[PDB]
Design an enzyme around this catalytic site. Sequence first.
Site, PDB file in Angstrom:
ATOM      1  N   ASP A   1       0.943  -1.502  -0.026  1.00 35.14           N
ATOM      2  CA  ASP A   1      -0.060   0.043   0.172  1.00 35.14           C
ATOM      3  C   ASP A   1       0.838   1.274  -0.092  1.00 35.14           C
ATOM      4  OD1 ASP A   1      -2.156  -1.736   0.428  1.00 35.14           O
ATOM      5  OD2 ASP A   1      -2.063  -1.856   2.227  1.00 35.14           O
TER       6      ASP A   1
ATOM      7  N   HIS B   1      -3.699  -2.066  -7.033  1.00 36.01           N
ATOM      8  CA  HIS B   1      -2.961  -0.988  -7.567  1.00 36.01           C
ATOM      9  C   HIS B   1      -3.786   0.034  -8.249  1.00 36.01           C
ATOM     10  CE1 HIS B   1       1.172  -3.594  -7.339  1.00 36.01           C
ATOM     11  NE2 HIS B   1       0.249  -3.672  -6.221  1.00 36.01           N
TER      12      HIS B   1
ATOM     13  N   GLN C   1       1.934  -6.270  -2.359  1.00 36.64           N
ATOM     14  CA  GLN C   1       2.271  -6.374  -0.950  1.00 36.64           C
ATOM     15  C   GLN C   1       3.773  -5.476  -0.634  1.00 36.64           C
ATOM     16  OE1 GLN C   1       1.167  -9.865  -2.479  1.00 36.64           O
ATOM     17  NE2 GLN C   1      -0.541  -8.369  -2.195  1.00 36.64           N
TER      18      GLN C   1
HETATM   19  O1  LIG Z   1      -1.621  -5.951  -1.347  1.00 36.23           O
HETATM   20  C1  LIG Z   1      -1.651  -5.791  -0.009  1.00 36.23           C
HETATM   21  N1  LIG Z   1      -1.570  -4.687   0.699  1.00 36.23           N
HETATM   22  C2  LIG Z   1      -1.490  -4.536   2.015  1.00 36.23           C
HETATM   23  N2  LIG Z   1      -1.495  -5.667   2.904  1.00 36.23           N
HETATM   24  C3  LIG Z   1      -1.743  -6.668   2.167  1.00 36.23           C
HETATM   25  C4  LIG Z   1      -1.810  -6.951   0.813  1.00 36.23           C
HETATM   26  N3  LIG Z   1      -2.113  -8.265   0.403  1.00 36.23           N
HETATM   27  C5  LIG Z   1      -2.212  -8.856   1.439  1.00 36.23           C
HETATM   28  N4  LIG Z   1      -1.654  -8.215   2.533  1.00 36.23           N
HETATM   29  C6  LIG Z   1      -1.688  -8.932   3.833  1.00 36.23           C
HETATM   30  O2  LIG Z   1      -1.350  -9.936   3.841  1.00 36.23           O
HETATM   31  C7  LIG Z   1      -1.402 -10.591   5.035  1.00 36.23           C
HETATM   32  C8  LIG Z   1      -1.769 -12.061   4.853  1.00 36.23           C
HETATM   33  O3  LIG Z   1      -2.987 -12.168   4.001  1.00 36.23           O
HETATM   34  P1  LIG Z   1      -2.807 -12.704   2.318  1.00 36.23           P
HETATM   35  O4  LIG Z   1      -2.326 -12.093   1.287  1.00 36.23           O
HETATM   36  O5  LIG Z   1      -4.340 -12.809   2.163  1.00 36.23           O
HETATM   37  O6  LIG Z   1      -2.418 -14.209   2.271  1.00 36.23           O
HETATM   38  C9  LIG Z   1      -2.266  -9.579   5.783  1.00 36.23           C
HETATM   39  O7  LIG Z   1      -1.958  -9.052   6.859  1.00 36.23           O
HETATM   40  C10 LIG Z   1      -2.987  -9.074   4.563  1.00 36.23           C
HETATM   41  O8  LIG Z   1      -3.551  -7.620   4.880  1.00 36.23           O
HETATM   42  O1  LIG Z   2      -4.565  -2.122  -1.830  1.00 35.74           O
HETATM   43  C1  LIG Z   2      -4.741  -3.214  -1.224  1.00 35.74           C
HETATM   44  N1  LIG Z   2      -5.191  -3.076  -0.089  1.00 35.74           N
HETATM   45  O2  LIG Z   2      -4.857  -1.762   0.857  1.00 35.74           O
HETATM   46  C2  LIG Z   2      -5.077  -4.338   0.745  1.00 35.74           C
HETATM   47  C3  LIG Z   2      -6.390  -5.030   1.288  1.00 35.74           C
HETATM   48  O3  LIG Z   2      -7.588  -4.404   1.116  1.00 35.74           O
HETATM   49  O4  LIG Z   2      -6.444  -5.882   2.055  1.00 35.74           O
END
Ligand SMILES: O=c1[nH]cnc2c1ncn2[C@@H]1O[C@H](COP(=O)(O)O)[C@@H](O)[C@H]1O
Ligand SMILES: O=CN(O)CC(=O)O
Lengths: 431, 431
Positions: B13, B41, B224
């Site tokens: 983010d 994104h 991420q």
């Molecule tokens: O693109 C992202 N931006 C911010 N946090 C993310 C993003 N994708 C996954 N997370 C974080 O990844 C962790 C595990 O989630 P996962 O990606 O669902 O396997 C959590 O803390 C999610 O919020």
């Molecule tokens: O831009 C992506 N998000 O902030 C992650 C989420 O919504 O969990």
Amino acid sequence: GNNVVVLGTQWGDEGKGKIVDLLTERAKYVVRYQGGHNAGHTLVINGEKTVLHLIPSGILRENVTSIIGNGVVLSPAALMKEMKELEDRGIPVRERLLLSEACPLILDYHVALDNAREKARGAKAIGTTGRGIGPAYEDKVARRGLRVGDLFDKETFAEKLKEVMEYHNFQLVNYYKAEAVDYQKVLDDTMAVADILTSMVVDVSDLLDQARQRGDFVMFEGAQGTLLDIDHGTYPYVTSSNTTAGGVATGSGLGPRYVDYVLGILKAYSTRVGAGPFPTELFDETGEFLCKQGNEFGATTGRRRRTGWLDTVAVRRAVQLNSLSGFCLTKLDVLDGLKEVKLCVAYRMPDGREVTTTPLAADDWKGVEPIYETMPGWSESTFGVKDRSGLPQAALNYIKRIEELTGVPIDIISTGPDRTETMILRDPFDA
Amino acid sequence: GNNVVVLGTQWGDEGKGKIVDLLTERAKYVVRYQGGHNAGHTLVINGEKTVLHLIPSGILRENVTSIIGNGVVLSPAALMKEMKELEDRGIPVRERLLLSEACPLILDYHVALDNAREKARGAKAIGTTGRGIGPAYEDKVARRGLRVGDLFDKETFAEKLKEVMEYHNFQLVNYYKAEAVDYQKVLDDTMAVADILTSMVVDVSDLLDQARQRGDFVMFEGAQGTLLDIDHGTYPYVTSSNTTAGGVATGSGLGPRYVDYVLGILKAYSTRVGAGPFPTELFDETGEFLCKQGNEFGATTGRRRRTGWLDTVAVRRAVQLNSLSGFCLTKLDVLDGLKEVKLCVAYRMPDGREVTTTPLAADDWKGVEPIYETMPGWSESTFGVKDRSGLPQAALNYIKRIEELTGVPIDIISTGPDRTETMILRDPFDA
Ligand SMILES: O=c1[nH]cnc2c1ncn2[C@@H]1O[C@H](COP(=O)(O)O)[C@@H](O)[C@H]1O
Ligand SMILES: O=CN(O)CC(=O)O
Ligand SMILES: O=c1[nH]cnc2c1ncn2[C@@H]1O[C@H](COP(=O)(O)O)[C@@H](O)[C@H]1O
Ligand SMILES: O=CN(O)CC(=O)O
């Protein structure tokens, strides 16, 4: 380059241990970036053997700090096993070896699982080494696994352990109708080695950043081989980690921009252990000849290895994937006596096309046949030859055409299992 | 450098979509090397928004071939979803987008599993996006998963599918007491998009080898952020893939030696979504101010984002891990109006020590407190400023001390969400 990567260009068993031990002379560190104790890196110094499985091949060198990076799945039992064995032979393993608290742990239940799943496959069994590798990597990606750093608090560990085993056993017993592996037992075994590992723990990525900034000679040692990559390999007949140089920066913590020279270990002929595609596979005396001569038997399991001619196609992929800077030709002397020699220059696709690119997943390899260039062998002996002048013209030609075919130079030539029976035409740390 | 890597230095983010779209001007290819549709994104061209999840941020550019590499876990449903949305807005997604047959597939059962496991965690829930990411990466490492190339033969696919679901459902129903997700339904949905994906399939690693040899401008886009790395992150409060530049060569197939410039996207302040350590976390009006102003709400879930001051320590790790060549400072204008500003220069360990290195697994972060350097803010407006001359001395100073603290230059400064509200002090493709 200071940061040299030595990896398997084929399916593993190319002879990496010997090269790591060989080149470690000027190195301060040797790092394993993946795999587990599924490997069997054999060292021969003056004719004295040492089979390494999880321990980095720079363990028999006073000057080198051997490192087991975060990418590596660590089995407490195997580590303890290997150490004593080396310790009994004068290698102060604990003064030499370091490990990442990030390293995943492999326990009893991972092997039980590894075996049930394999059996569960019936005929479609992968031919895994049955060391819990597959399952250990799984629990990790699941964010359910135990890493080395969980031993930091044995109280929460036992709790975390109870939960995870609680889960696995339901499946072992309830799904696979297999016996349950006991929590207290695995707990007892684990907590009996807890203090050892934790004392070898260091910050590997921060560590390597400093060496890099100082200009130290770092050696990242691979296990398995390019065609066993979980992504880029012959899926699902692969290993569960990335055996391509990219797994170097992921399982060590080194900046991807700091890798200086990717050295590809290339055996003069091919081999495979475990199920899976292998175009240039031979099922005739030539293929049996190679077996008996290259002594192709699994060093971890003792399984008979499948043999075949060199496949410049499967190799050319390895080349691009790892940005190989050069090759180290291993076991060339195993070719001695042969009349004709054969390298695979292309594949004949099942639809009739001719390609110089390999398919991807195992299925995609189906009716794929190999196109060869036959070359004259050599009756002369190559074993122990430490120089080209002693290599017969044929041998020399086989080598050159390999370079030509791949566009990558045979920088080192290994003419025997002993450290000294080799040729360094170009040193990686120099060039 | 031709091969530029743009990745998140924090917890995601940070604003990567905008930079990928920004810098893609001279690029022929944009490649996603990991993640899934868990990302969001956001692109703003002339004030027109586009939220990308799985689709690479170079999708709105005629000249760019967007690529979804093998590292990426692909959800057939999400892909189809996004395309139509873009297609309805004049973006011929199918003429622009390419994907790897190596890409893991995410299906109904992966989300059900993702949710059961999360629930199963009670209070210790990770705060996953609930998109089956975690489970999809699991099945892969297990060598039990479905990749894109399995659609090549729908007959064996349905068979492979029946087997895998057969397995997952026993656990869903029998262990988690959750409903079973139907095989025929998931089969029906899948086989209805099968032909689309398969037609976008290409040999990504072989593809990129050619571009590299020709000297094309390649852009690898991360999802991420560094502290969500499965290995190097705050385990188990991480994502299931490697968000560090090393995952670039593993999930694309590019030679690790071909990465030219690792561009780190650095937001002027920190944020976290999902459970996990966050030292510089603020729970006061300053932290709420940032929320409302940086509009910190999950773009995939819409979850309120946790905020905090910039943490040069968690950043300094990111630096070493990714061999960052430079920074792109995002959201600096969100700082406007603030009196004092604060960057974390070090951590106070629970045992009383002061360190400038971050702990590893989530547990290790326990009593860790932040040490700051307070700086004067600026009441002036920074939004839209496309040049330094318009940046107030304070802002300028905040920037410099950041470079000083990290030893890495703020190469680009983003002063607003629109493509044009930015500053390129140094171009990555140039320098
Ligand atoms: O693109 C992202 N931006 C911010 N946090 C993310 C993003 N994708 C996954 N997370 C974080 O990844 C962790 C595990 O989630 P996962 O990606 O669902 O396997 C959590 O803390 C999610 O919020
Ligand atoms: O831009 C992506 N998000 O902030 C992650 C989420 O919504 O969990
Ligand atoms: O180091 C090795 N050398 C050769 N083959 C290996 C090695 N380690 C694992 N394999 C192969 O990896 C595949 C999967 O087994 P895994 O490593 O047990 O998960 C099988 O084909 C194994 O034989
Ligand atoms: O050296 C390692 N072996 O050949 C692998 C095995 O035994 O499975």
